[PDB]
Design a protein around this ligand. Sequence first.
Ligand SMILES: O=C(Nc1ccncn1)c1oc2cnccc2c1Nc1ccc2c(O)cccc2c1
Length: 262
Amino acid sequence: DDWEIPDGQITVGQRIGSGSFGTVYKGKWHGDVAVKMLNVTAPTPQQLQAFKNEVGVLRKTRHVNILLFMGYSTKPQLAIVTQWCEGSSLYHHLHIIETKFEMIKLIDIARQTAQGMDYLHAKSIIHRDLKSNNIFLHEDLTVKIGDFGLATVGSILWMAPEVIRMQDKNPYSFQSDVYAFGIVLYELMTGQLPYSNINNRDQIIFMVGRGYLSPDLSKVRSNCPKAMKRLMAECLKKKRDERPLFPQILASIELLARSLPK
Ligand SMILES: O=C(Nc1ccncn1)c1oc2cnccc2c1Nc1ccc2c(O)cccc2c1
């Protein structure tokens, strides 16, 4: 029943990039796998706590739209093993290689992402870093949400105003996740990262924090449904209490999807 993996079984290949508290590699373990390592060297209790946190969260998830946790290793290096998705993150698709998806496909990506988040929230899991970088598109038609290093039970463009202005102990909530999801709806419907006409990261943090800046929803392509534009504004609300929860969001996306291909 346990998920630990003995030293030697995992074969590490290509270094493909970074993830919360470490480095992502392509690996071999009963097939292609993603492996994230939280060392170099003897680990800090800082690392240890980050490791045990994520593993604990992942072993609680079993759902199509969530990156399948497969196992973990401590023996050589603190490592987390999940399934492999060829064809990159929504971020890479959108802002690097510039894949121009169709609206039917874009809406589907939103519905599937909403689907995974509803699951997470129904399980009382708050991702706390939902962004296009962590939305991986497996075999070009199935959305898997990954990276749970920050989750519980600086990528600022997705941060809610409350989260920006670090007030009280806990700014993170279902609603802050909803907000981050709002920005992915933006990325999907505009094809752009928000605030792209401002070349000052700090002015962006200050401004959104004080509520002077909000995503310009006039940039959504003309074939994007009005109901989607309407839902986006609801997720991007400056007051966290005025946001809908994912059950409600999911029902919204399903509805517009049904009466669309006509
Ligand atoms: O990083 C990637 N792709 C990139 C990264 C940067 N630039 C381009 N492509 C990347 O490419 C992948 C392919 N398949 C699965 C996962 C990833 C993945 N990322 C992650 C993120 C978090 C992980 C975690 O928290 C635990 C275990 C595995 C993890 C894998």
